């Protein structure tokens, strides 16, 4: 995983810095600012900054630790933010930073809700608003209290990509469907710890599985195994 650190403080007017190490490339930083809403994409590949985005965020990276920079934070910026990367063959996520301040694409996600422990889930994603064949998509979990896990990944061509967090490896198979502008995660031999908020993801690529390339998420879908 990740490495950033586990908090910062900071008054509004501040220029915030938050580091993060352990990527084999690029950097992306995701903003929650609840545990039950969406995440934000506030910076992608290092540098990229999404276009509805304010401009006092940007991003850098150095050698091979990547830098979110805050340039005049103000309250509303009160969030967890969380970078994302990649390595060894898969996304990968920093357990998150919370920083406090002291003063048309969609995807919609579905198949969630009570699990039988032992059996299997299916989870569709529902894209709109861009052409979801050029872009590869994936999927990020969140256990109640925890940060982001990367799931699963796959290739615009929904063949030639596909990869899966150690986690799941043997029990999940993602698979999309071009025509249908859907991605399917399938689950099996479900256990406690898969329960989580399950996130479409698309990624502004074609075929990468980093989780620093992440411009848009879903809504979430709670999967709970009791």
């Known amino acids: 995983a990740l490495t950033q650190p586990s908090s910062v403080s900071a008054n509004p007017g501040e220029t915030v810095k938050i580091t993060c190490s352990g990527s084999?490339?690029?950097y992306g930083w995701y903003q929650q600012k609840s545990p039950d809403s969406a995440p934000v994409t506030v910076i992608?590949?290092?540098?990229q900054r999404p276009s509805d985005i304010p401009s006092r965020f940007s991003g850098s990276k150095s050698g091979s630790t990547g830098t979110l920079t805050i340039t005049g934070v103000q309250a509303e910026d009160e969030a967890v933010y969380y970078c994302?990367?990649?390595?060894?063959?898969?996304?990968?996520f920093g357990a998150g930073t919370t920083l406090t301040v002291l003063g048309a694409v969609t995807l919609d996600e579905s198949g969630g809700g009570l699990q039988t422990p032992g059996g299997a889930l299916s989870l569709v994603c529902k894209a709109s608003?861009?052409?979801?064949?050029?872009?590869?998509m994936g999927w990020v979990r969140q256990a109640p209290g925890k940060g982001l896990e990367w799931v699963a990944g796959?290739?615009?061509?929904?063949?030639?990509?596909?990869s899966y967090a150690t986690a799941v490896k043997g029990r999940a198979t993602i698979s999309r469907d071009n025509g249908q502008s859907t991605v399917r995660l399938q689950l099996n031999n479900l256990r406690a710890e898969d329960t989580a908020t399950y996130y479409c993801?698309?990624?502004?690529?074609?075929?990468?599985?980093?989780?620093?390339?992440?411009?848009?998420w879903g809504h979430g879908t709670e999967v709970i195994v009791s």
């Open positions: 994302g990367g990649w390595g060894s063959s898969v996304g990968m």
């Open positions: 992608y590949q290092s540098n």
């Open positions: 993801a698309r990624s502004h690529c074609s075929g990468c599985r980093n989780a620093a390339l992440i411009d848009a």
């Open positions: 084999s490339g690029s």
């Open positions: 796959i290739s615009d061509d929904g063949d030639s990509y596909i």
């Open positions: 608003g861009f052409t979801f064949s050029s872009y590869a």
